[PDB]
Subunit: 136 residues, 6 copies
């Protein structure tokens, strides 16, 4: 296929208790029977699959200091700066599912573009850290 | 110096009308006298200085989609993923000044670490885009 | 095509002695008549093609401090961190050809994910280098 | 300070039972008293500290696919390609402590430089994936 | 489609004065009726579209310290180092349109490869900045 | 030290015939006695030192497609986008020594910032490649 690993289908996963447990938890957690490809590739290693899902579930689900949409927008900006194409798609879809409006999307993009610009400029100028930033 | 350009000080900026216009605008906009070093470096090219500041005002300052703190936390996240040291400092400072609490900072860091990991894993596996995402 | 440069075929390469010399050496070295696309794009500039191949041959082939499989796993991790999609494919194939097991692959992935995480966290925290790391 | 978070010292960690549990576990695991600064930064968020340490133990410590040194050299390579200065230092130190010799270090650097170059060249040419790799 | 945003067509754009103004300026500036996809995705947010185009027009068009071809080659090298696949294509096409020869292209590639190599080596070695570089 | 390898000084290089050959060649090539620290780090692996220098001479030095300054400015741009601090310094210095003026430096920075922004925006939107670019 196009991944460097096999993408496991539901039929195979039902024969793999460790993997089925994780996939059913994803579905129960997300409120949808759709589980996206990232998980189907991680499924080749049950231990990694569970470590990754447990993190995602802890960080991105439940009460916390930031609302779920805000968390997805941060995830989307990070995915972009890391130039992960799949991640740009999945987290844009997830942001939309968590209520991201066109207006909000446009602003997220604007920030990602501006930040990339100023980051590059700072790096080219080798701006030293202001001493005011270093006070305890 | 330590930068690859000179960092213009206030004394020099006094006699540079196009540049003082921006520094005045920055100070008038942030309510403070302190202008950080990025701007002092950009000041070598008054046009680029103006363009950069205009973008920052439009995107970052005022009524808009997202609150100022949310914008700043997205800005911090980008700065980290792009590996810019100065920028991590500057935008951690900005987010705090815009009211980022310890609790919020901890969750931003957790999201940044987690996204770094999944991004890396997806890239290694070369996961193709779900047809669902394309409809 | 899809590359920003032409991909040279065997028929054309046989008319180009400088390029044919390199391609035949790749085949002799690798023990296979298959030469992958990277080389076919580099072939547009014979000098660059030979500089690149000579490096690859020196670093990745022959006795050295690390075994060939270990070298490919490092190459694969680097390719990933540099987000080169083609390189993720080619070096996963090369790692497999050099004996990488499913278990080993899963561990390489695990390290790449964990390292990306801790690298990001360190960068966000701007952790200063421990003085113990700086002793001569 | 120089970090964007405080680096908890042993005195503070003494009275932080969830955090001392991890520092004790780290020390008990590495056989040494020295815990590097990354952990002291992570200690501000005891949960993230625990999660990060659990991953490191599972992936990096003990019987597994690859020897500990090989794991460390892959970790070093990633850290370099991601451009993390602290991490280059920390994992060069770890690899040496796990027995990386001058000769091995030189070859890792050579591979890292070479991969950087070919990755860059492939990206510029936008080489499509061979159909062979997809069967 | 394949973008995470809609790509606006000419028919729709003619109903959107703000967006049509920008697109016609691109065409007038570039001397061609072809406007590439980046602009059609930015078109979902007129304000961002105009901010981006105004920058591009100011920096990349008109008299300045560097000739237009040189500007495109720098843009292409940056795009590559940022691993933006679309940008590698568009700026290679733009460089060619501004007169880039095969010989020049090969040299740009050579520099991009070499720089990526030395940058990686310096980073792995953590080479400290020579004091000679720090004199005012 | 501050580097993860030792930086060989001229005294050590005196008695290292393969390495002095390169340092002599570098100095003979640049017309100057000053050899920057990158080479002193590479000198730990004489073979890698030689390979790296051979590439630099072939690509960067002499008659070729592009003038030496243009090559250096492309090299600077790459170094910035790859986020290498030392390299930003070294290649800003090289470009100046090869005649980069304030005006040229300002435009390089402007291009680097602009490309960073559009690259980021294209990646976020996942713009597909125009069929025009593929004919
Ligand atoms: Na002054
Ligand atoms: Na204390
Ligand atoms: Na000495």
């Amino acid at each position: 296929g196009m991944a460097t690993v096999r993408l496991l289908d539901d039929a195979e996963i039902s024969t793999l208790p460790e993997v089925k447990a994780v996939f059913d938890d994803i579905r129960a957690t997300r409120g949808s029977d759709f589980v996206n490809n990232i998980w189907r590739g991680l499924a080749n290693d049950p231990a990694l699959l569970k470590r990754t899902w447990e993190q995602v579930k802890t960080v991105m689900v439940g009460e916390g200091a930031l609302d779920p949409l805000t968390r997805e927008m941060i995830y989307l900006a990070v995915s972009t700066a890391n130039s992960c194409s799949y991640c740009a798609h999945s987290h844009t879809a997830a942001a939309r599912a968590k209520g991201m409006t066109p207006a909000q999307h446009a602003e997220v993009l604007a920030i990602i573009g501006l930040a990339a610009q100023t980051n590059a400029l700072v790096t080219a100028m080798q701006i030293p850290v202001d001493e005011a930033f270093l006070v305890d």
